Amino acid sequence: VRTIKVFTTVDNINLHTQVVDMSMTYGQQFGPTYLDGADVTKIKPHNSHEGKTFYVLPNDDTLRVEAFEYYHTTDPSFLGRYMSALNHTKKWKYPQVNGLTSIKWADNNCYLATALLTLQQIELKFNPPALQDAYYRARAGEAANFCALILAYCNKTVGELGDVRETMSYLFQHANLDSCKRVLNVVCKTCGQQQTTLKGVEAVMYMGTLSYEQFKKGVQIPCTCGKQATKYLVQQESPFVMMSAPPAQYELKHGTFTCASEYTGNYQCGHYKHITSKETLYCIDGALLTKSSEYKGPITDVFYKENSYTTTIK
Numbered sequence: 001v002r003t004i005k006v007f008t009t010v011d012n013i014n015l016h017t018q019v020v021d022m023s024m025t026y027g028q029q030f031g032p033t034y035l036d037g038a039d040v041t042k043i044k045p046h047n048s049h050e051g052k053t054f055y056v057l058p059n060d061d062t063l064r065v066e067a068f069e070y071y072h073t074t075d076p077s078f079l080g081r082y083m084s085a086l087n088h089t090k091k092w093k094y095p096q097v098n099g100l101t102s103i104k105w106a107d108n109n110c111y112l113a114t115a116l117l118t119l120q121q122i123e124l125k126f127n128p129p130a131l132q133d134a135y136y137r138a139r140a141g142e143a144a145n146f147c148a149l150i151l152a153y154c155n156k157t158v159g160e161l162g163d164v165r166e167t168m169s170y171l172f173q174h175a176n177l178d179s180c181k182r183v184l185n186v187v188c189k190t191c192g193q194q195q196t197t198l199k200g201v202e203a204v205m206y207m208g209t210l211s212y213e214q215f216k217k218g219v220q221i222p223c224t225c226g227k228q229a230t231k232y233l234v235q236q237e238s239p240f241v242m243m244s245a246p247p248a249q250y251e252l253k254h255g256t257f258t259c260a261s262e263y264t265g266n267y268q269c270g271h272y273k274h275i276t277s278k279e280t281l282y283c284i285d286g287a288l289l290t291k292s293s294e295y296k297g298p299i300t301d302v303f304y305k306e307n308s309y310t311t312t313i314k
C-alpha cells in the first residue's frame, strides 16, 4: 500500500490532512473531488499531488458547518456549480481599465463585466466570507473566483445570457443593506395619497425610471384604479441607489451619476457596456476603452451616490 498526504477543504480556509491510497480513485475515498476547479473524482492520485488542496462536498457535520459559515447557503449543488464555473472563469482575462478590473469578452460575460465594474464603484459590504474574500482578489486583478461565485449564487452557468439588474438583485440579497430605508408617497386624483416605507434591497432598487432627479420630483405610474398616479421620493437612507428601466435613448451628464449600464439589442440577444463618470465620461466595453465629454445611448441602469435625502415637498 503506497500513500500520499493531501489536504481536503470546502472553503480553502480550513485544510484537513488526509492519507490517500494511490490504488483507489479520489471519488472512492472522498466522494466528488476537485483540484483547482478540475473534477478529479474518476482520477487516481499522482505523486505530484503530495501536499495539494482538493475541494470535496460537505459529506459530514464538520464540513457542512464550515461550508455554511463561508458561503451562507445549504444548497448541496452549490460547490459543484462554483467549481464547474471556476473551471471556465480561471481561463478569462481580467484587464485593468481606468484603474478597475474588467473582463475580456467571452461566453456572453458582458453582464458580469458590467456588474463587476459597478461593484468596484459603489459602497457595499458582502456578508458571506466567500464573497468578501473573492471580491478583494477581484479588486487586485484576479476576479475568476468572484465571477464563479456570482454565477453559482445566481444559479447561472457560464455561456448563459444575463441581466445586470437581476444579477445585482441576487448579490444585494447577500450584502448588508439592512439599515437602508426608502419612503415613497403616491398621489392619485381618484384614490388619494399612499405613503410606503421600504427596507433593504427594495430600498436601493427602482424599475421604471433612470433619473434620480425625476424620482424626487415625481414619476407617472399606473394606479390600481386604472388612472395614472404620481410617485415621488420622500426620504432615502443608503450609500447608493440603482435606477433601472427598459433600455431607451438617454443623456448621461459628467458629474451627475456614478456609473451606468448601456444595453444594445433586444431582450433575446444584446451587448452591455459600462459608462463611468470620472474627470470625464469613460465607456468600458470589456478590454476596450473610449472617452467623451458627453454620452447619448440606450441606458438600462444608472447608479447614484447617496447618504441621506429628505424631500422639501409638504
Ligand SMILES: C[C@H](c1cccc2ccccc12)N(C)Cc1ccc(O)cc1
Residues within 6 Å of the ligand: 161, 162, 163, 164, 166, 245, 246, 247, 263, 265, 266, 267, 268, 270, 300
Ligand atoms: C437589459 C435587458 C432588458 C431588461 C428589461 C427590459 C428589456 C426590454 C427590452 C430589451 C431588453 C430589456 N436584459 C438583458 C434582458 C435579459 C433578462 C434576463 C436574462 O436572463 C437575459 C436577458
Ligand SMILES: [Zn+2]
Residues within 6 Å of the ligand: 188, 189, 190, 191, 192, 223, 224, 225, 226, 227, 229
Ligand atoms: Zn387610483
